[PDB]
């Protein structure tokens, strides 16, 4: 969806400045959980 911004390092820093850190932590731990879930999914 709007994920295309996430794999772009330049604007990612930028739009991250306008967000607080306490949310950034939330988002990251959210992201890390999501990606861990597909590791099992694909697997082998």
């Amino acid at each position: 969806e709007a994920l295309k911004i996430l794999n772009n390092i330049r604007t990612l820093r930028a739009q991250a400045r306008e967000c607080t850190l306490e949310t950034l932590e939330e988002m990251l731990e959210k992201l890390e959980v999501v990606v861990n879930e597909r590791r099992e999914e694909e697997s082998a």
């Binding site: 949310t23 939330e26 959210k30």
Partner: protein, 67 residues
């Protein structure tokens, strides 16, 4: 408006199903730009409703248990 503010309101919500309902009603009524912050409080409440514990800040462990 801040996330805690939404979380205060959503804190009143019980049995998840009711929360799903209020969250569902909010989706179509909210400011969109404002809606995103509500989603932060929404996840928090659902998490702290999924586990029946009230966290000020959500531990990384629980997110896996979210449906």
């Amino acid at each position: 408006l801040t996330k805690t503010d939404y979380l205060m309101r959503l804190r009143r919500c019980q049995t998840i199903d009711t929360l799903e309902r209020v969250i569902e009603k909010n989706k179509y009524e909210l400011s969109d730009n404002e809606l995103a912050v509500f989603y932060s409080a929404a996840d928090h409440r659902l998490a702290e409703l999924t586990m029946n514990k009230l966290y000020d800040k959500i531990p990384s462990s629980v997110w896996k248990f979210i449906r």
